[PDB]
Design a binder for this molecule. Structure first.
Ligand SMILES: *C(=O)[C@H](CCSC)NC=O
Ligand SMILES: [Mg+2]
Ligand SMILES: [Mg+2]
Ligand SMILES: [Mg+2]
Ligand SMILES: [Mg+2]
Ligand SMILES: [Mg+2]
Ligand SMILES: [Mg+2]
Ligand SMILES: [Mg+2]
Ligand SMILES: [Mg+2]
Ligand SMILES: [Mg+2]
Ligand SMILES: [Mg+2]
Ligand SMILES: [Mg+2]
Length: 47
RNA sequence: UUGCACUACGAGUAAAGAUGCUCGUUACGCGCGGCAGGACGAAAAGACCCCGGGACCUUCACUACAACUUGGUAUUGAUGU
């Protein structure tokens, strides 16, 4: 699943860049901790 | 229990062991008490045996299945080597 992240994650990206991740790292670690959101409209709220 | 009935015996004969058929012999009609030789006595659609069917049991008979177990894949991520 692809994510527009909000914090800084080592080995994954800086703020705001969209990146696809292995779908268990998304819903278990980056989404409950608030470090990312989905990529459906935030690319327009980043651009 | 019961097809009948004024239901003898001998030698025969016959589905090959006869109250009932042949040839003889014997026996007045009807009861009561006893005995248990026959009526292949009664009872039980022979348990034996065989044929057909069934059931349960056995196992290195056949096919399955539970259980137990093997790997892949999903749940399932991150980082070094
Ligand atoms: C033999 O096993 C025996 C014979 C019966 S005699 C008519 N049966 C026993 O049950
Ligand atoms: Mg997945
Ligand atoms: Mg005779
Ligand atoms: Mg005679
Ligand atoms: Mg006569
Ligand atoms: Mg007489
Ligand atoms: Mg008498
Ligand atoms: Mg007798
Ligand atoms: Mg009898
Ligand atoms: Mg019989
Ligand atoms: Mg397994
Ligand atoms: Mg498995």
């Amino acid at each position: 699943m692809k994510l527009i992240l909000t914090a800084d994650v080592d080995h994954l990206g800086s703020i705001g860049d969209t990146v696809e991740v292995k779908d268990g790292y998304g819903r278990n670690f980056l989404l409950p901790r608030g470090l990312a959101i989905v990529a459906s409209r935030g690319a327009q709220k980043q651009a």
